[PDB]
Design a protein around this ligand. Structure first.
Ligand SMILES: c1ccc2c(c1)CCNC2
Ligand SMILES: [Mn+2]
Ligand SMILES: [Mn+2]
Lengths: 137, 137
C-alpha cells in the first residue's frame, strides 16, 4: 500500500544556482550537498536536486502542465509572491483556475506554484464553482 | 514560509488510462473527476491529473531524471512490485542506492519510484559513506 510522496527529485542543469534558488530564495532547509546533488526539506517534503547533463532549461511554452505546488499560509502568500516577482523570478501562469496560487519557474523551467489551501478546501470550493463535468466521489 | 508540498500535478495525454493507473493499479483514492482532470490522494499527497494535449508519451531515454517517489513499507514492497510487473508496467532503472526502490513508468512516461526509507535514513547512511564532495549542514 502506498502512503504518500517519499521524495521529489528534480533534475537540474547547474547545481549551485538550483541549490541557491531552493535554499536562499524559497527558504527550504539544506541538509547536504555533494558534487552531483543536494538534499533539502520543506516541512515534511524531501526534495532531491540531481545534477543531470540531460536537463535542459525549458521555456514554459515548451513543457506540459506538470507542476509542483508548495503550501503557504494565507498570511504569508502575497508578500512571498511579491518578493519572488521583485527578484525577477519568471512566471508561467496568471489565471487562478484552482484557487489562490502564484505560478513561477525555477532556473531550469521546472513549473512551481505557491498555493493556499488543502485538497478538502479545494473540493469544497469546487462544489460551488465546479469544473466542467465534475463528479465528486 | 513554505510548509510542505501542497500538490503534485501530472499532465496526462488520456484521462481514463491515467485514472485507472493511479486509482486501480496503484490504489490511490479518487476524490473527483471532471472532463479535463482528476483529484486523488495517497496518504497526505494530493495528486492532480490534468488532461493536456501537449503531453507526449515520452520514452525514458528521452526525459531527464526528474521523478516522483511514493512511500511503501518494506513488508509491502515486493508484492507491490510484483503487481506492477504482472500489469506489464515498465521499469526505467535498477536500484543501486540504499533502501529498497522500484523504478517504474506511468502511461505517459512519468518517472515513478516506490521507495522504502526516509531522508533521515538516507542522511545517516551518507554520513557513514559520503558521496564524492559531500558536505553536511
Ligand atoms: C541523489 C539524488 C536523488 C536520488 C538519488 C541520489 C538516488 C535515488 N533516487 C533519487
Ligand atoms: Mn497547481
Ligand atoms: Mn528517487
Amino acid at each position: 500500500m502506498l502512503s504518500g510522496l517519499n521524495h521529489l527529485t528534480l533534475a537540474v542543469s547547474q547545481l549551485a544556482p538550483s541549490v541557491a534558488f531552493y535554499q536562499q530564495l524559497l527558504g527550504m532547509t539544506l541538509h547536504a550537498r555533494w558534487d552531483s546533488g543536494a538534499y533539502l526539506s520543506c516541512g515534511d517534503l524531501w526534495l532531491c536536486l540531481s545534477l543531470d547533463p540531460q536537463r535542459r532549461v525549458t521555456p514554459p511554452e515548451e513543457s506540459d502542465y506538470t507542476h509542483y505546488a508548495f503550501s503557504i499560509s494565507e498570511a504569508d502568500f502575497a508578500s512571498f509572491a511579491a518578493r519572488l516577482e521583485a527578484a525577477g523570478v519568471a512566471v508561467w501562469k496568471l489565471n487562478r483556475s484552482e484557487g489562490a496560487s502564484h505560478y513561477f519557474l525555477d532556473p531550469d523551467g521546472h513549473k512551481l506554484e505557491l498555493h493556499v489551501g488543502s485538497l478538502a478546501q479545494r473540493l469544497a470550493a469546487c462544489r460551488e464553482q465546479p469544473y466542467k463535468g465534475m463528479v465528486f466521489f
